[PDB]
Structures are given as structure tokens and as C-alpha cells.
Amino acid sequence: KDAWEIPRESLRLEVKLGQGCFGEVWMGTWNGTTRVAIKTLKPGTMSPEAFLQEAQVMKKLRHEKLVQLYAVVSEEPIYIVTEYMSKGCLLDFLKGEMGKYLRLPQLVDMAAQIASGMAYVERMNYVHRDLRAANILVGENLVCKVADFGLFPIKWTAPEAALYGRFTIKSDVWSFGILLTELTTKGRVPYPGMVNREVLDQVERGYRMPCPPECPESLHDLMCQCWRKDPEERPTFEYLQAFLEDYFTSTEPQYQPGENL
């Protein structure tokens, strides 16, 4: 009934990318030419209206650094069609064969992109609630886009959010700080060696992750600003974007490439 609808013959489902509890994820082709990602709803598992809220949100939030909705099939069996990002989630990308080649100039640039996407979320007064590398999609030429696989993650979650349910754009900023450690460690789990119960407490006592090996101190300092006890004292995404884009001229103009970063 809307301009997003497509015939069912428009979609070729080519390669299965993952199975969930409510359906599947496929790489495929829309209109014989456009490479596409296809999200499946297994009937009976979830309200059609519930599954289609994903598309409704993706219609309202459009930006070059947010995952793009292409089309829907809104009658059961339902299909949600989005743009195909050829490198998968950032986490897998960072951990995989491409890990070793990425250095700080690339990693900061990816950060700048994510920040930009999140700066749009900021302008829209939306909250992500689960920003981290597993929810970032990577495409050609290191293009990064904010996304949500919808599939707890206290290690990435701001204390006030984890404890008191206070999820804001500022608990997103905290998460972005943790995202920065994922970028600088090539995808390792944050707070290595600590279980979930060890993180929540120590963070409340004021523990913050130390500067990762080879990371410039100015970048760790930026993480620390994202990790301030007081949500309102955390920097805006607009600020994070600008800082990251200008990093190699204004902040670290003497940066020398090392072993890993």
C-alpha cells in the first residue's frame, strides 16, 4: 500500500548469512542488478506489525552513514530489504584477515564515519541503545554505517543505563568510547579477563580501560571523555565527529605508523 512495496519475483535470495529466532538473513539481488540484504520473518514467531517496526524506523531515519532501507514485502511471508554491505559487521572485519592491515589513520576515519552517523541520530533525538562494532556495517572503500542487528551487553553500556535504565544519546556516547577500544585493539572484547559482574562494580568505583598498546594518548583521553561518570559532561557526537575528522592535522600531526597502529 506504499511506495516501498516490491513484487516477490524482484528478490532473488542467493546466500544465507544467518538464522535467528524470528527468521533469516540473506544476501540477494533486487531487480536482477542491485546487491541486497534480505531479512526474513518466520510466520507465527512475531507479530507482522512488530517485525515491520524495523522498516518504519528505517523510513524515518535516513543518512549516508545509517543503513539504508530499500524495500519491503509487507504481507506474510514478510521480507525487509536493505543495502548490502560487502564486508559484514565491523567486529568480524576487525578480527578477520583485514585486521592486520588497518592502522590508526583508517581506524580513526571509520570512527569519524560512525560518529557522523551518530551525529545524525543526535540531531533526530533518537537513541541507539546498542552502539558497538557488532552493530556497524562495513562496505567498499572502508565505508561504515550505523545499524542494528536487533540480537546483555553491559560491557558496552553506560552505568546509569545498565543500572537505572537511563538510556540517552549520552549513554550512546559512552558506548562509542568502548567502540573506540574495539577499533584500536582490532576487535578484542573490552575489559579483557573481566566477567559482567566485575565490570559493573569497578566502573562505579571509577575503573576505566587503560590506553591500548600503540594508541596515542590523545585518543585514549577522548575515550575517557566519553566515559565520564556524569552523562551531561560527555561530549556530543557533533564534537566527536569534528575531532575525529581533524585528528591528524590538529591533534596528532606528528603521528608515525607503527607495528599495529
Ligand X SMILES: CN1CCN(CCC(=O)Nc2ccc3ncnc(Nc4ccc(NC(=O)Nc5cc(C(C)(C)C)nn5-c5cccc(N)c5)cc4)c3c2)CC1
Query: Which of these segments, 60-68, 167-175, 219-227, 252-260, binds ligand X (CB under 6 A)?
Result: 60-68
CB of 95 vs ligand X, minimal distance in Å: 8
Report in angstroms the alpha-carbon separations of 81 from 46, 180, 183. 18, 29, 28
CB of 253 to ligand X, least distance (A): 33
Q: Which is nearer to ligand X, 92 or 214 (CB)?
A: 92
Note whether 223 binds ligand X by CB under 6 A.
Answer: no
- Rule CB under 6 A: is residue 37 a binding residue for ligand X? yes
User: What's the CA gap between 186 and 197, in Å, rounded?
Assistant: 24
Catalytic, out of 2, 109, 130, 221: 130
Annotation marks residue 92 as catalytic: no
Helix axes 217-226, 237-245, angle to 10 degrees: 170
Is 93 labeled as ligand-binding? no
Q: Kindly report the CA angle at 48 between 124 and 73, in degrees rounded to 5?
A: 80
Among 57, 163, 189, 224, binds ligand X (CB under 6 A): 57
Residue from 78, 147, 169, 199 that binds ligand X (CB under 6 A)?
147
Minimum distance, C-beta of residue 100 to ligand X, in the bound complex (Å): 18
Query: After which residues is the backbone of the chain broken at C–N > 2.5 Å?
Result: 151
Q: Which residues of 8-45 are buried (b: 16+ CB within 10 A; e: fewer)?
A: eebbeeeeeeeebebbebbbbbbeeeeebbbbbbbeee
Q: Which of residues 69-108 bind ligand X (CB under 6 A)?
A: 82, 84-85, 88-89, 92
User: Which whole-number Å values give the CA distances from 141 to 109, 144, 173, 236, in the listed order?
Assistant: 11, 9, 25, 27
As beta bridge partners, residue 149 has none
Q: Return the residue of 11, 26, 30, 39 that touches ligand X, per CB under 6 A.
A: 39
Q: How far is CA 202 from the centre of its chain?
A: 25
20 annotated as ligand-binding: yes
| Contact flag: residue 25 with ligand X (CB under 6 A) | yes
Q: How far is the CB of 58 from ligand X (least distance, A)?
A: 5
97 assigned binding-site residue: no
137 binds ligand X (CB under 6 A): yes
Catalog residues that contact ligand X under the rule CB under 6 A: 17-18, 25, 37, 39, 53-54, 57-58, 61, 66-67, 82, 84-85, 88-89, 92, 128, 137, 146-150
Catalytic residue positions, numbered: 130
